[PDB]
Amino acid sequence: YKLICYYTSWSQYREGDGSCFPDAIDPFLCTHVIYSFANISNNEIDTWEWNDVTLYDTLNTLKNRNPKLKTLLSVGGWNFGPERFSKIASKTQSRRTFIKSVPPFLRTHGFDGLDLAWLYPGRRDKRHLTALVKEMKAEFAREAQAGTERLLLSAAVSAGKIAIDRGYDIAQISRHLDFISLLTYDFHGAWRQTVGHHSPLFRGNSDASSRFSNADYAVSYMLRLGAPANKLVMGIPTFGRSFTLASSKTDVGAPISGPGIPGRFTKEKGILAYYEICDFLHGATTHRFRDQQVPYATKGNQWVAYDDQESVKNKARYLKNRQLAGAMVWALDLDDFRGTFCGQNLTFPLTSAVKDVLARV
Ligand SMILES: CC(=O)N[C@@H]1[C@@H](O)[C@H](O[C@@H]2O[C@H](CO)[C@@H](O[C@@H]3O[C@H](CO)[C@@H](O)[C@H](O)[C@H]3NC(C)=O)[C@H](O)[C@H]2NC(C)=O)[C@@H](CO)O[C@H]1O
Ligand SMILES: *[C@@H]1O[C@H](CO)[C@@H](O[C@H]2O[C@H](CO)[C@@H](O[C@@H]3O[C@H](CO)[C@@H](O)[C@H](O)[C@@H]3O)[C@H](O)[C@H]2NC(C)=O)[C@H](O)[C@H]1NC(C)=O
């Protein structure tokens, strides 16, 4: 089984204990660690943060401890305009320029592959997406003739039915990609004003619509569109999504006024790190959707949909029973990496729980 884990560059700026450097990553926890995110300038892959080359170096030295660890560099992300991707992939000339620039960059900094994070391709992008993947892999096969291990190519894919039908030729890109990460944790659209869980495993016997917004559906669909199970990696969140309540109603369908107040270390409305949730739980009322099998909490006018060790173990069992390639975690720096916030003196509570289940066979 594969345990693919993301590390974000900007987590270095969080104050105090929230500050996280590649340094904190346990080299034996994951099988693959992906660094997010790289930029594109003059149609070439390029660094993002001023100290990326120092951090690249730090992350890749972990391979001196665990020789079997693979690292990848991810391009794109949310703060990268999807149009910018759209523009590079559409003109076969800027596409070739970008593709060509990747292997040397990866080789200079020591990465073992490239992760594509185009969020998200639209209807007019589908065909170009396929071409970008096809050609990038062809370039990787050709570069391995130099006598070095082929670089890996992976992609982070939307888990929404509409998004998938709209911009991805799954049967096509699955043949060229080494693995596909399913973003199965973005299921409650910031668009509506009701309370809901962003990463339910199952449909939830109490609701006739949006039966497409749960991990189980997303996986069954991908397997149907033609994605081989041994290439599919299911995403597991290490963060929670918060909401400020509009009334004293706390159960399903309860109304919302907007996102929850920011976390002290994460400082971003609507999001909380797991270690921040561990603190938030004190004095909070914990509940759990039984059909969906995911927990949520409430304190004052704050409502939080998250994942704990047992829902995370649950998801990992699910993934094994359906025989997928492994699990993907977003993101290491949101888990209790210091291990000093969530009670039990365990480092990376959530990611470890996932690894334990995966090691059982
Ligand atoms: C749940 C989750 O991971 N959400 C992701 C977003 O957090 C993320 O946006 C990032 O936001 C943070 C802050 O909102 C940005 O960090 C800032 O980075 C700048 C420039 O490097 C630095 O000077 C600031 O100190 C730092 N601000 C903070 C809050 O301390 C970060 O740059 C954003 N990401 C990027 C690459 O721009 C986006 C990332 O696209 O992904 C969400 O999934
Ligand atoms: C990721 O790469 C982007 C694409 O190369 C890069 O885009 C930006 O590049 C420059 C620098 O900020 C911006 O500014 C312009 O630069 C010329 C200076 O030669 C000025 O004459 C002009 O007035 C303008 O200020 C562009 O606006 C901008 N291009 C974009 C967004 O398409 C990004 O800076 C880079 N992102 C990061 C964080 O590195």
Task: Kindly write down the DSSP assignment for every residue of 315-330, as one continuous string.
Answer: HHHHHHHTT-SEEEEE
Q: Are residues 175 and 116 in the same domain?
A: yes
- What CATH code is carried by the domain that includes residue 35? 3.20.20.80
**Number of domains present in the structure of the chain:** 2
Left (φ > 0), alpha (ψ -120 to 50) or beta: where does 42 sit? left
By the 8 A CB rule, do 2 and 40 touch?
A: no
C-alpha 352/C-alpha 358 separation (Å) is 10
- Tell me, yes or no, whether 120 and 144 share the same domain: yes
Q: What Cα–Cα distance (Å) separates residue 98 from each residue in 44, 90, 104, 358?
A: 5, 12, 11, 36
d(CA 249, CA 255): 7
The range of the structural domain enclosing residue 7 comes to 1-238+307-361
Residues 127 and 189 in one domain: yes
**Distance in angstroms (rounded) separating the CA atoms of residues 44 and 213:** 36
Lookup: tokens for 11: 């987590």
- 3-class state of residue 251 by DSSP: coil
Which of these, 315, 301, 306, 271, lies nearest to 287 by C-alpha position? 306
Ligand 1 site residues (CB inside 6 A) read 10, 13, 37, 49, 77-79, 239, 267-268, 271, 331
Neighbour count for residue 287 (Cβ, 10 Å): 13
Judgement on whether residues 157 and 265 belong to the same structural domain of the protein: no
Torsion of Cα atoms, 36 then 39 then 40 then 46, to 10°: -90
48 lines ligand 2 (CB under 6 A): yes
HEC string of 152-190? EEEEEEECCHHHHHHHCCHHHHHHHCCEEEEECCCCCCC
250 lines ligand 2 (CB under 6 A): no
User: Which ligand gives the minimal distance to the CA of 87?
Assistant: 2
Tokens 């969140």 identify what position?
Answer: 237
Both 267 and 220 in a single domain?
no
Taking CB atoms within 8 Å and a gap of at least 24, the contacts of 49-56 are 49/9, 49/10, 49/12, 51/12, 52/9, 53/109, 55/9, 55/12, 55/21, 55/22, 56/109, 56/110, 56/111
- Nearest-CA residue for ligand 2 atom 26 is 41
25: left (phi over 0), alpha (psi -120 to 50) or beta: beta
Q: Which of 306, 321, 352 is the last residue before a domain boundary? A: 306
Residues 285 and 138 in one domain: no
Beta strands in 2-125, from DSSP E residues, in sequence order: 2-8, 32-41, 44-46, 70-76, 113-117
> By C-alpha distance, which of 165, 168, 141 is closest to 153?
141
Torsion of CA 297, 302, 303, 304, to 10 degrees: -70
What approach was used to elucidate this structure? Answer: X-ray
| Per-residue DSSP letter, 123 | T
Q: How many residues does the chain have?
A: 361
Please indicate, yes or no, whether residues 184 and 281 belong to a single structural domain of this protein: no
Q: What's the Cα-to-Cα distance from 334 to each of 81, 244, 272, rounded to whole Å? A: 24, 21, 8
**Cα(293)–Cα(203) distance, rounded to whole angstroms?**
10
- CB of 50 closer than 6 A to ligand 2? no
What angle, 0 to 180 degrees and rounded to 10, lies between the N-to-C axes of helices 92-109 and 52-60?
A: 60
Cα of first residue to Cα of last residue in the chain, in angstroms, is: 8
Residue 45: strand pairing partners:
40
Rounded CA-CA distance 163/161 in Å is: 6
**Domain end (from 289, 306, 323):** 306
Alpha-carbon dihedral angle through residues 268, 292, 327, 142, given to the nearest 10 degrees:
-80
272 close to 336: Cβ distance less than 8 angstroms: no
On whether both 168 and 50 belong to a single domain, the answer is yes
Residue 360 alpha carbon to ligand 1 centre in Å: 35
Bridge partners for 241 per DSSP:
271, 305
> What is the experimental resolution, given in Å to one decimal place?
2.5
CB 15 within 8 A of CB 190: no
d(Cα 329, Cα 344) in Å, to the nearest integer?
20
Residue 11 CB neighbour total at 10 angstroms: 21
Chosen domain end from 287, 306, 325: 306
Give yes or no for a contact between 161 and 153, defined as CB atoms under 8 angstroms apart: no
Give the CATH number, domain containing residue 244.
Answer: 3.10.50.10
Whole-angstrom distance, CA of residue 214 vs CA of residue 212: 6
Same domain, 46 and 109: yes
Q: Which atom of ligand 1 is nearest to the CA of 80?
A: 40
Q: What is the dihedral of CA 57, 346, 337, 66, to 10 degrees?
A: 20
209 plus 163 within the same structural domain: yes
CA–CA dist 331, 335 (Å, integer):
7
Residue 221 in contact with ligand 2 by CB distance below 6 A: no
Same domain, 104 and 179: yes
The Å distance, Cα 41 to ligand 2 centre, comes to: 8
291 with 314, same domain? no
Q: Which atom of ligand 1 is nearest to the CA of 36?
A: 36
